[PDB]
Write a protein that binds this ligand. Structure first.
Ligand SMILES: Nc1nc2c(ncn2[C@@H]2O[C@H](COP(=O)(O)OP(=O)(O)OP(=O)(O)O)[C@@H](O)[C@H]2O)c(=O)[nH]1
Ligand SMILES: Nc1nc2c(ncn2[C@@H]2O[C@H](COP(=O)(O)OP(=O)(O)OP(=O)(O)O)[C@@H](O)[C@H]2O)c(=O)[nH]1
Ligand SMILES: [Mg+2]
Ligand SMILES: [Mg+2]
Lengths: 246, 258
């Protein structure tokens, strides 16, 4: 089972830590860095932006995405093709890390997500959500959601048409953008960020939205992300190239 | 007694909150920089305080970011110079608006200093007393803070950036100032929220997992930064501004004037 995830965010925003917390293991890796791991049945490829934010900031991200689409298309056009044996490297989900300023959505993040909306399944997350207290975090979420909806940004939504998963997925959609916290520490057993005044529990829903985000890794949800990638995002790219090739 | 403080940092980095925490008072301003003046009072000692905040700092090219800050600083120097050169001058009836200290807010990334930060502080070193601070330090654990401070100090030293150091010459209190210099860059935490503990008002940031206590030295370096408001330290900041930074500006202008 292949699954490709992209983390877009500024330097030191917590991309690597969240990936480690998500899959409960370390990941060892010039604008993008990708590495493939075999988790035990799941072949995972994690991609992470380098120096992002340091107009054209999103270009290397878009180019990477287009190149994975192109590799798949060329395989699809082959005379002697073997799609089953082919390693799908197309990005199935993009976690867009939003800085916990407590302010509003930055213009760069707005433009970037607008250009990614029809290229990849975009899921916005609030990085280092322990930066913000509970009350102003809900105001910050509402502000972000307001700008996303007003600017008509087509972020990804988990499917709620099937009653078998409607309850889980509707709750997930209500928590978007996910207030995330990552950690490489473990105490008596969960993962925590330990301060002298207290410890943030990653897997505690009263502290952050990590448990909601982790439900993305449910089989039905990963399959939906892959299906939309192939049937919508890839098709958009494919139709464009077929026009060019003629 | 006048004292002018400038806060340089990106949007939402916590400039206004720190100023409120530092002086125990909300500041209401009235567009690259904002400045407002308040009259404060401890017992029977008056203080004419001016706070200055950057606006949208880090949104523009590196040069275009620190340029309005340098221009503001130079402008206060120019106003003082023109008054000093006046025929019918009255230096006592003149409001000295020269910036005495600059708090440069460093984002709590836990990694290194941004390239924009190094260039900015290098441009400000001979214009104003620069004191680097780590903003929102309650978002950094103690092991990561110790390592973060080290890398910051290392890059400042290797780039020959002359940040301000508190005087350790006078017998009392050089002990206090020596400890202050050891804490640079100050790990700062601000808060507009306050509670009453043991009959005293205490500013805190309250999370579901606990509360950060601003005045607690075991939580952040705010108490060390507040020692900048000691009379001897404020006067040293003013003196260096007048005797060193302003004179540097003055000499260049005298040449240009011919
Ligand atoms: N407050 C807070 N700090 C975090 C969190 N997650 C990670 N950090 C810290 O932030 C720093 C950044 O960690 P990384 O995961 O390497 O950030 P990054 O996005 O991978 O940065 P680069 O890949 O180097 O560009 C680390 O020192 C972490 O200890 C979080 O959820 N909350
Ligand atoms: N975690 C944390 N949050 C803080 C701290 N200080 C302020 N904040 C929060 O961060 C947000 C930014 O507050 P401000 O002080 O207005 O930030 P600013 O630098 O003045 O931003 P500008 O609008 O550009 O002036 C506020 O909502 C505060 O609640 C802090 O020390 N730690
Ligand atoms: Mg990383
Ligand atoms: Mg402010």
């Amino acid at each position: 089972f292949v699954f490709n995830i992209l983390c877009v965010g500024e330097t030191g925003i917590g991309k690597s830590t969240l990936l480690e917390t998500l899959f409960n293991q370390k990941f060892d890796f010039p604008k993008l860095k990708a590495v493939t791991y075999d988790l035990k049945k799941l072949k995972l490829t994690v991609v992470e932006t380098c120096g992002y934010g340091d107009e054209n900031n999103i270009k290397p991200v878009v180019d990477y995405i287009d190149n994975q689409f192109e590799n798949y298309l060329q395989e699809e056009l082959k005379m002697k093709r073997s799609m089953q044996a082919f390693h799908d490297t197309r990005v199935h989900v993009c976690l867009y890390f939003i800085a916990p300023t407590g302010h509003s959505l930055k213009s760069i993040d707005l433009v970037a997500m607008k250009k990614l909306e029809n290229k990849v399944n975009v899921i916005p997350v609030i990085a280092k959500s322990d930066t913000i207290t509970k009350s102003e975090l809900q105001k910050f979420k509402a502000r972000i959601l307001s700008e996303i909806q007003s600017n008509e940004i087509g972020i990804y939504q988990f499917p709620t048409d099937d009653e078998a998963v409607s309850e889980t997925n509707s709750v997930m959609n209500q928590h978007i953008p996910f207030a995330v916290v990552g950690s490489s520490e473990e105490v008596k057993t969960v993962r925590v960020r330990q301060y002298p005044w207290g410890s943030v529990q990653v897997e505690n829903e009263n502290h952050c939205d990590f448990v909601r985000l982790r439900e993305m890794l449910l089989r039905v949800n990963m399959e939906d992300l892959r299906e939309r990638t192939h049937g919508v995002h890839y098709e958009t790219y494919r139709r464009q190239r077929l026009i060019e090739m003629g």
